[PDB]
Amino acid sequence: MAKSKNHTAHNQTRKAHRNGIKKPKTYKYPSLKGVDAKFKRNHRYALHGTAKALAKARAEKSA
RNA sequence: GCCUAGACCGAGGACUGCGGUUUUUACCUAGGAUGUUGGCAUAAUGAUCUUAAGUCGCCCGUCUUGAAACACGGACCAAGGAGUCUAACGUCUAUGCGAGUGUUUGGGUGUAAAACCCGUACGCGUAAUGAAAGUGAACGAAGGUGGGGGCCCAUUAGGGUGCACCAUCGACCGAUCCUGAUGUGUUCGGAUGGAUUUGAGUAAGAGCAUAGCUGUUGGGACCCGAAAGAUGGUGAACUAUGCCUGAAUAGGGUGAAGCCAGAGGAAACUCUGGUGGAGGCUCGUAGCGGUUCUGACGUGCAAAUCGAUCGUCGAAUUUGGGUAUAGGGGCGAAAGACUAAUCGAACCAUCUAGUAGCUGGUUCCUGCCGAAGUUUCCCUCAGGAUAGCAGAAGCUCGUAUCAGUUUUAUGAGGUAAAGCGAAUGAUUAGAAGUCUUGGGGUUGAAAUGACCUUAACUUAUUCUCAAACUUUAAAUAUGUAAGAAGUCCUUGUUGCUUAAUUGAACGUGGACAAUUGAAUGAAGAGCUUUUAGUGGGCCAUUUUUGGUAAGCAGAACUGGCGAUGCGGGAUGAACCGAACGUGAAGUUAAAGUGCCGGAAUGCACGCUCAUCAGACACCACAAAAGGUGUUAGUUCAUCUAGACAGCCGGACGGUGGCCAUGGAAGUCGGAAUCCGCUAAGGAGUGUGUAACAACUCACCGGCCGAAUGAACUAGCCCUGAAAAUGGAUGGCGCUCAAGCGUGCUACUUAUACUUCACCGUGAUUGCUGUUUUGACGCUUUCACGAGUAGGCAGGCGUGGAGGUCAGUGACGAAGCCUUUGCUGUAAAGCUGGGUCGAACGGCCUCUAGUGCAGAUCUUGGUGGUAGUAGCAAAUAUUCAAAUGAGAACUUUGAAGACUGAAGUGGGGAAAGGUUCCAUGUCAACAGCAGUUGGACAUGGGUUAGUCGAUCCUAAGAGAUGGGGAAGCUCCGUUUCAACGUGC
RNA sequence: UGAUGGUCAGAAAGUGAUGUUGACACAAUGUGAUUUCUGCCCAGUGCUCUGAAUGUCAAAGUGAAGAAAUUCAACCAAGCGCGGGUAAACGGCGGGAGUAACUAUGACUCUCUUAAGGUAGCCAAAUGCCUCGUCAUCUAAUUAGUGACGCGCAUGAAUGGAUUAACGAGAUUCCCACUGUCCCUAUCUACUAUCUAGCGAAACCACAGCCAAGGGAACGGGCUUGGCAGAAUCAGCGGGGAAAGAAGACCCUGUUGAGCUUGACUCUAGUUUGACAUUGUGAAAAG
RNA sequence: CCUAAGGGGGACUCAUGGAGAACAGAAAUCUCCAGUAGAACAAAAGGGUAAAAGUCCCCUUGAUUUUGAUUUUCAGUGUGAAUACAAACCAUGAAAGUGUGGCCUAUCGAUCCUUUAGUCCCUCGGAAUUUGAGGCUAGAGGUGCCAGAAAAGUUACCACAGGGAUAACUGGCUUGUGGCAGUCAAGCGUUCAUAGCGACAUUGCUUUUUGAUUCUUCGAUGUCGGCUCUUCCUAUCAUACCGAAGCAGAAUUCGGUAAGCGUUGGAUUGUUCACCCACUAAUAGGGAACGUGAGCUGGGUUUAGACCGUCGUGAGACAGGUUAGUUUUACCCUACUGAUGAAUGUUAUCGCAAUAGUAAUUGAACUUAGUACGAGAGGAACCGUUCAUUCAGAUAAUUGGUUUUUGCGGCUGUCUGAUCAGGCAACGCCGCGAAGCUACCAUCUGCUGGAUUAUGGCUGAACGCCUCUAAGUCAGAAUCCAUGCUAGAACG
RNA sequence: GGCAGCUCUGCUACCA
Ligand SMILES: [Mg+2]
Ligand SMILES: [Mg+2]
Ligand SMILES: [Mg+2]
Ligand SMILES: [Mg+2]
Ligand SMILES: [Mg+2]
Ligand SMILES: [Mg+2]
Ligand SMILES: [Mg+2]
Ligand SMILES: [Mg+2]
Ligand SMILES: [Mg+2]
Ligand SMILES: [Mg+2]
Ligand SMILES: [Mg+2]
Ligand SMILES: [Mg+2]
Ligand SMILES: [Mg+2]
Ligand SMILES: [Mg+2]
Ligand SMILES: [Mg+2]
Ligand SMILES: [Mg+2]
Ligand SMILES: [Mg+2]
Ligand SMILES: [Mg+2]
Ligand SMILES: [Mg+2]
Ligand SMILES: [Mg+2]
Ligand SMILES: [Mg+2]
Ligand SMILES: [Mg+2]
Ligand SMILES: [Mg+2]
Ligand SMILES: [Mg+2]
Ligand SMILES: [Mg+2]
Ligand SMILES: [Mg+2]
Ligand SMILES: [Mg+2]
Ligand SMILES: [Mg+2]
Ligand SMILES: [Mg+2]
Ligand SMILES: [Mg+2]
Ligand SMILES: [Mg+2]
Ligand SMILES: [Mg+2]
Ligand SMILES: [Mg+2]
Ligand SMILES: [Mg+2]
Ligand SMILES: [Mg+2]
Ligand SMILES: [Mg+2]
Ligand SMILES: [Mg+2]
Ligand SMILES: [Mg+2]
Ligand SMILES: [Mg+2]
Ligand SMILES: [Mg+2]
Ligand SMILES: [Mg+2]
Ligand SMILES: [Mg+2]
Ligand SMILES: [Mg+2]
Ligand SMILES: [Mg+2]
Ligand SMILES: [Mg+2]
Ligand SMILES: [Mg+2]
Ligand SMILES: [Mg+2]
Ligand SMILES: [Mg+2]
Ligand SMILES: [Mg+2]
Ligand SMILES: [Mg+2]
Ligand SMILES: [Mg+2]
Ligand SMILES: [Mg+2]
Ligand SMILES: [Mg+2]
Ligand SMILES: [Mg+2]
Ligand SMILES: [Mg+2]
Ligand SMILES: [Mg+2]
Ligand SMILES: [Mg+2]
Ligand SMILES: [Mg+2]
Ligand SMILES: [Mg+2]
Ligand SMILES: [Mg+2]
Ligand SMILES: [Mg+2]
Ligand SMILES: [Mg+2]
Ligand SMILES: [Mg+2]
Ligand SMILES: [Mg+2]
Ligand SMILES: [Mg+2]
Ligand SMILES: [Mg+2]
Ligand SMILES: [Mg+2]
Ligand SMILES: [Mg+2]
Ligand SMILES: [Mg+2]
Ligand SMILES: [Mg+2]
Ligand SMILES: [Mg+2]
Ligand SMILES: [Mg+2]
Ligand SMILES: [Mg+2]
Ligand SMILES: [Mg+2]
Ligand SMILES: [Mg+2]
Ligand SMILES: [Mg+2]
Ligand SMILES: [Mg+2]
Ligand SMILES: [Mg+2]
Ligand SMILES: [Mg+2]
Ligand SMILES: [Mg+2]
Ligand SMILES: [Mg+2]
Ligand SMILES: [Mg+2]
Ligand SMILES: [Mg+2]
Ligand SMILES: [Mg+2]
Ligand SMILES: [Mg+2]
Ligand SMILES: [Mg+2]
Ligand SMILES: [Mg+2]
Ligand SMILES: [Mg+2]
Ligand SMILES: [Mg+2]
Ligand SMILES: [Mg+2]
Ligand SMILES: [Mg+2]
Ligand SMILES: [Mg+2]
Ligand SMILES: [Mg+2]
Ligand SMILES: [Mg+2]
Ligand SMILES: [Mg+2]
Ligand SMILES: [Mg+2]
Ligand SMILES: [Mg+2]
Ligand SMILES: [Mg+2]
Ligand SMILES: [Mg+2]
Ligand SMILES: [Mg+2]
Ligand SMILES: [Mg+2]
Ligand SMILES: [Mg+2]
Ligand SMILES: [Mg+2]
Ligand SMILES: [Mg+2]
Ligand SMILES: [Mg+2]
Ligand SMILES: [Mg+2]
Ligand SMILES: [Mg+2]
Ligand SMILES: [Mg+2]
Ligand SMILES: [Mg+2]
Ligand SMILES: [Mg+2]
Ligand SMILES: [Mg+2]
Ligand SMILES: [Mg+2]
Ligand SMILES: [Mg+2]
Ligand SMILES: [Mg+2]
Ligand SMILES: [Mg+2]
Ligand SMILES: [Mg+2]
Ligand SMILES: [Mg+2]
Ligand SMILES: [Mg+2]
Ligand SMILES: [Mg+2]
Ligand SMILES: [Mg+2]
Ligand SMILES: [Mg+2]
Ligand SMILES: [Mg+2]
Ligand SMILES: [Mg+2]
Ligand SMILES: [Mg+2]
Ligand SMILES: [Mg+2]
Ligand SMILES: [Mg+2]
Ligand SMILES: [Mg+2]
Ligand SMILES: [Mg+2]
Ligand SMILES: [Mg+2]
Ligand SMILES: [Mg+2]
Ligand SMILES: [Mg+2]
Ligand SMILES: [Mg+2]
Ligand SMILES: [Mg+2]
Ligand SMILES: [Mg+2]
């Protein structure tokens, strides 16, 4: 009495290709989410020290 | 290179350009048609209306995969008729002010619901976070890195600065967890430093208010629609049942008790004849009922009747009036029956516009874009939410680095195929070995020690298989890469890592410049918000599952239909071709070219003849098996040392060898079988004798001479081949086709392609010292145009409002009718003529009860049907006169009839209410008529001490004293009463 | 059910029906004249009966702990549970093998098992599937009728069994009579229909109205291809208009109902049981 | 399901086969050799595993704590499950290491409420103390319809909104099944495959069976059967003409052209179907919306009443039996059957014939003839003759039926005073009754040519023969077309 | 899930 269509993938690639299928954008810096915490913890200290060294190097060349 | 025939078109509107010839600051064919002539202007020309001809054209709206449907609504017309308003909101936009913002609760004021003015509070915002106690946002130029429009310096490039914004690493505030300083109401405090944790935060505020569209929720909620539910009332004039008081019921039959007489008997008792008049007895009227014809009728005489037939007919009978019982109630000799045409829960009003995931409807035009039937969840499966698909608004930028594609490089796979003397599983046949750990038999007097056999295993082989087997293993499809965010050199940071000076990650500085590292393309890339419809699908090729199959059910990929017209397939949602603005010319696609029908009875090679031919994919059917029909092949074989066929000789022998016994020289029949001259043939092939015969042989002869036989293959045709109205290669018809196979030339024509005109959309060129009273404008160029549901835009029309035209109008507003026309793609606007009589319009804005073909829509009106169905029960009318305009129907007379005293007579109860009577009178009514009437009009008319009511009480109804009940009111009827308006 | 009652009514009442009543009565049911009979089962579900002792067991009350709220414990009514009765209460009333000097059957025996295992009767019956059972009768022929039979799907005793004179607009079979029911139709009468004068509706209606085939929502009036096709019409007729009448009453769906039932879920009038209050005055005895 | 079947470490090698050892054997235990796993690993199946993941031994609790990230299903939500780390604390091992349950792929659960653990922290808001209560973080108690309401029936008294999204007819696709027909040819048939049959197989047709499906119809297409009537099909029962036989005759069987023509009366049953009786030339099968209900009927089915049996506690059910149960409308269009009719200068008479329709059918008796044939038993046919069946078209002499001839007569009741003569009895009744109508209940009439089918032939090639055929040709069926019969085109 | 008697019968109770 209520037997209908069960499943069909007909027309699904047509709909996917109207506005897709879009590749994700790439960025210079990926997010570090999921990267090892021990590496991420230390990587914070390495970047902080790098900024200090560059700041001092420029501070030498200013006054 | 040259000559030559025809057709269609003429956009643009001073000049500017590119070229050419230069005889030249000139001319040209070179950035789009001019010249000339005739005719006509009472007309050649154009438009519309009507009609004919040719061709095409199914009925709209609706739900649907699919509608012209034998699906639903729609007889017709007019007027009305359906997304509204409000509270609170999301996005976006406009506006004012802006770390603020909002005057309008209120006060002041007023030309008085207006306008104008005022301010405290309060709301929202400016701070978050935690359940809370509580705590509460700068290490730094409010941080670093990579981009980033613009600006600055430059001078391709390059450098500086870089807002918004993007990615990323940090910092700060709150919560959570860890650590725990000086100290202390010794249990508090919480400094300091941390943590793959967490917040709708900070990190130089952005909000508030008003308005508009769209979307949301609650409200009647786009309009119309339940079956139901509740509250409060009204009914027992029908009917059901009880009660009270009345009334009604021919004529027969039968013949119970009791009684009288006679007869018999010892008694107990018996018999006979009368009489009598019983009975929920019986025949049968009135009455009450309602069996059958399943009669009539069945838009009726009638929302239950009519006729005949029938049940019952002295009681559980029939019936009037009074009275009681009332809706989850009554009443029921019980059928869920009856309770006013209403009953498995009456009627009335209200709650109530009840709710509906369901059906129906949903009103102007054009332009642009344009779907889904799929994912997940849901008492979900006719519904929603969610994601997707779609529109709109845009925003940041301007070739940055993207793609339903290829190439090159490099991965993954276990399907097709293949395999099985490869694993697993299935499976056919032999062969060789061992049985010593198989039986039977035969050896053995007994030795388990041989042999014959089958069956087992073993070995090397053999035939055939697998979706849930496999060593191997495609095609198609699929992942990644092809640089500047790259490569190389040097050396900075860390608490991570190393034995380390090693690495990891991120960096400073330097080098490699457009061949910056494959192709092809790119109406540009990126980003955001918000919202519609949809969430039944179906079809075709190929893959594929279930099923005998199905126009069946279920999947995969793609393309379609839905949502889509156009040319072809006669016809047809989907097939082939091709997708669509309005046109002109040319050419085609698919399909065709005998006629219907535009284009060949065209050119060509063959095949086929059907006493059911055949005739074009999807597709509208035919098979196995057959044919000395005909055609073409293949392989054998015989052939001029005369093939097959036919006319004509022979085939003598050894030997009549043998057996069957009627006889075998083959021949009722049988095993068999050697030798002499021939161009030739045997102890014999059929025919023939019971037999010897004799013929032909099996061969070779003569006669013309040249082809012949067998098996097989596949073309067309034929057999196989049977269905129901007459009938379909679409029809006619077609036979060296107008059929079948194949080739060729030309030709025909789609909304397709090419060139051109015009419309619109998108983009694009330029336009201010000539911008010049339109820059929301003008202008250059190119591309494009299908569309249901749906979105958006620009317009048309209607009622009313502010403003304006010092607008139109009684010398004619508005309305209405009309081949009077004009304008617009259109919605529509304007106008000529006629009619008409008092108001009305244009423009800029505001506002809404604003647009109809549908809703078995509402109300009103009108058709076809159609002068049709019909006006046929109750026996029946006729002549004359009178009256009158008029006589089937009135009156009177004469006649003929009927009811036939249980009447068609004479009165009454209920109910009606003037219908009664006289006079006048015919518009309507009396389903014909009408002089008549219960019609219409004017008058008149009902007389009581004795006839009724009035009085009595009946079943019952109902005050009081009282007692309940919130109360409307309920009980009770002399009741727990000091009860006389006493005589 | 003996009235301080049974059955029933009312919101309540100093309220009602039966009841102007009293077991030969009132109330509640079942079966359904007469005749002959009404067998077995009290395990189930009901109904009913006692409670000397007794599991569960509410509120109030009692005792203990606690600062109290509170908690815990004992006691603890009816009901239920326990025990008995009751079938003219609701109802129920069995299977498997062997066996007799042929065969068949099974008087008889064995075996499982119940509360009891269908008794007297009756039957292919209005109750029997198989089934049109088998035999007889009725007929030329009988799925009908009647009489028998009975391992009876699934007969059976006041959920009444078996009969039964009389009665029946009840259902059925046969026979006589009778006939147009029929062979097989014909004829006649009145009223219609018909025609006229007068009068004059309604249903229904997208547009309409000739066929055959095709395709098509798979049965066309319309479309395609054919056949064809000539005004205006009257009486009849019932092939078609998938004719009209009614938003299918069958079926399914809906998170739509309603009537009815019960051991559905959730309650409830009534009734019953306890406590407190109304509620006072004495005596005695047990705690 | 598992305190190991989790975790770590170590040692060993499994299934099975062969050869050997007292009882001991096919299977006890021991030994050696071979042994790629042919074993085992809790449980389905697949993958995985050999100094192991298997077997045995030793030690253990990492099946622990904190909170993030990720994969699958996915909306990139939840739940389940899993992965890689961070920070602890541990187990094990010499150690490197490994371990966040089970070698991997399944083995599970929100809000509200309750309860426990933790922090012993926050709150009970006029201020405190102690009980009590409420919060915060993590488990547990559960929804199996497993993203998670709290839930029994019946309706044959029924209602509403809808649905052809969906069943009960027809129709359409299909044709398994039903029915019918072929091909091959092992056998049957005294012999002998094919006169007649025909196994094992195999190819079809049909839509007269029943399924399968669910395309149409649920704002309705009237659902059984019979009666009535017309038509069509052929897969032919009879009738015409023929071919074949295991055809002597008679009968019968097989087959061809053939649907022209017929195919019945009854008992029982609602029946379709069936089954008997009987006649007959034969009693063939089907279709037309399973033809046919505004044609009927209404026995059946299938509303509501009622009974029984079985089932159910019950209301009730039964596709079981039984009895009673409203069958509506045509006047429209078309079509059919008949009937008029304008205009084809008027009117009249007589005609022609396009086209359409069509009609006859079957039997018996006599004769042939007791003949052919046959041993006999039996036993035909053609020519012919007389009748009959079914049908058709007329007709009314006769006979019968019918009577409003109300024609004549008769009869009852009543009315007109009697008589005569009449009236009435919703034609009063009866007998006869002409005329008209009418009946196989009566009588009459129902034609002869051509062309063919099957088939049998002639001449005659192909194919020097043969051959009914290929060219040509003969006869020939109830067939066809005419003749004859009916209408006459209203636009011949 | 509470009582109680003989691994258990009876009664009573029920917000995930
Ligand atoms: Mg679906
Ligand atoms: Mg021009
Ligand atoms: Mg056309
Ligand atoms: Mg619709
Ligand atoms: Mg449909
Ligand atoms: Mg339509
Ligand atoms: Mg149709
Ligand atoms: Mg319909
Ligand atoms: Mg509908
Ligand atoms: Mg209609
Ligand atoms: Mg209007
Ligand atoms: Mg604030
Ligand atoms: Mg706070
Ligand atoms: Mg900020
Ligand atoms: Mg309503
Ligand atoms: Mg309700
Ligand atoms: Mg009354
Ligand atoms: Mg009657
Ligand atoms: Mg009737
Ligand atoms: Mg009638
Ligand atoms: Mg009578
Ligand atoms: Mg009933
Ligand atoms: Mg009534
Ligand atoms: Mg409404
Ligand atoms: Mg729904
Ligand atoms: Mg488009
Ligand atoms: Mg749920
Ligand atoms: Mg629908
Ligand atoms: Mg494979
Ligand atoms: Mg696979
Ligand atoms: Mg394969
Ligand atoms: Mg291979
Ligand atoms: Mg193998
Ligand atoms: Mg939506
Ligand atoms: Mg949605
Ligand atoms: Mg569907
Ligand atoms: Mg659609
Ligand atoms: Mg198309
Ligand atoms: Mg076309
Ligand atoms: Mg075609
Ligand atoms: Mg034609
Ligand atoms: Mg032409
Ligand atoms: Mg054809
Ligand atoms: Mg054609
Ligand atoms: Mg042609
Ligand atoms: Mg468009
Ligand atoms: Mg208005
Ligand atoms: Mg003026
Ligand atoms: Mg005018
Ligand atoms: Mg005017
Ligand atoms: Mg005026
Ligand atoms: Mg104005
Ligand atoms: Mg309106
Ligand atoms: Mg209208
Ligand atoms: Mg009318
Ligand atoms: Mg008339
Ligand atoms: Mg009448
Ligand atoms: Mg009389
Ligand atoms: Mg009068
Ligand atoms: Mg009148
Ligand atoms: Mg008149
Ligand atoms: Mg009057
Ligand atoms: Mg008096
Ligand atoms: Mg008085
Ligand atoms: Mg009284
Ligand atoms: Mg009082
Ligand atoms: Mg009883
Ligand atoms: Mg009992
Ligand atoms: Mg009992
Ligand atoms: Mg208590
Ligand atoms: Mg007790
Ligand atoms: Mg018995
Ligand atoms: Mg019986
Ligand atoms: Mg019976
Ligand atoms: Mg009979
Ligand atoms: Mg019988
Ligand atoms: Mg019984
Ligand atoms: Mg008894
Ligand atoms: Mg009984
Ligand atoms: Mg009797
Ligand atoms: Mg009777
Ligand atoms: Mg009676
Ligand atoms: Mg008539
Ligand atoms: Mg068709
Ligand atoms: Mg037709
Ligand atoms: Mg039609
Ligand atoms: Mg036509
Ligand atoms: Mg009809
Ligand atoms: Mg009629
Ligand atoms: Mg409906
Ligand atoms: Mg639902
Ligand atoms: Mg309900
Ligand atoms: Mg009801
Ligand atoms: Mg272990
Ligand atoms: Mg393990
Ligand atoms: Mg180990
Ligand atoms: Mg996830
Ligand atoms: Mg899971
Ligand atoms: Mg506080
Ligand atoms: Mg307080
Ligand atoms: Mg839980
Ligand atoms: Mg739960
Ligand atoms: Mg669920
Ligand atoms: Mg679920
Ligand atoms: Mg039922
Ligand atoms: Mg359907
Ligand atoms: Mg079939
Ligand atoms: Mg078949
Ligand atoms: Mg043989
Ligand atoms: Mg169907
Ligand atoms: Mg229907
Ligand atoms: Mg019909
Ligand atoms: Mg109908
Ligand atoms: Mg035939
Ligand atoms: Mg024959
Ligand atoms: Mg015929
Ligand atoms: Mg009968
Ligand atoms: Mg049929
Ligand atoms: Mg039928
Ligand atoms: Mg009919
Ligand atoms: Mg009818
Ligand atoms: Mg009936
Ligand atoms: Mg009934
Ligand atoms: Mg019972
Ligand atoms: Mg009756
Ligand atoms: Mg003779
Ligand atoms: Mg007389
Ligand atoms: Mg008289
Ligand atoms: Mg009379
Ligand atoms: Mg006579
Ligand atoms: Mg010859
Ligand atoms: Mg011939
Ligand atoms: Mg010939
Ligand atoms: Mg004529």
Solving technique = cryo-EM
Provide φ and ψ at A51, rounded to 5°.
-65, -40
Chain B positions within 7 A of any protein Cβ atom are: 144-146, 166-171, 195-196, 371-375, 381-382, 388-390, 402-404, 485, 492-497, 504-508, 526-527, 536-539, 553-560
- Do A57 and A49 meet the contact criterion of CB atoms below 8 Å apart? no
**Residue written as tokens 């902080």?**
A48
In this structure, the number of other CB atoms found within 10 A of the CB of residue A43 comes to 13
DSSP string, A4-61: ------TTHHHHHHHH-PPPPPP-SS---TTS-HHHHHHHHHHHHHHHHHHHHHHHHT
> CA A62, CA A8: separation in Å to the nearest integer?
70
**Residue written as tokens 């970047």?**
A47
> CA A20, CA A22: separation in Å to the nearest integer?
5
Radius of gyration of chain A from Cα atoms? 26
Please give the structure tokens belonging to residue A46.
């390495």
Nearest to A47 by CA among A34, A25, A29: A29
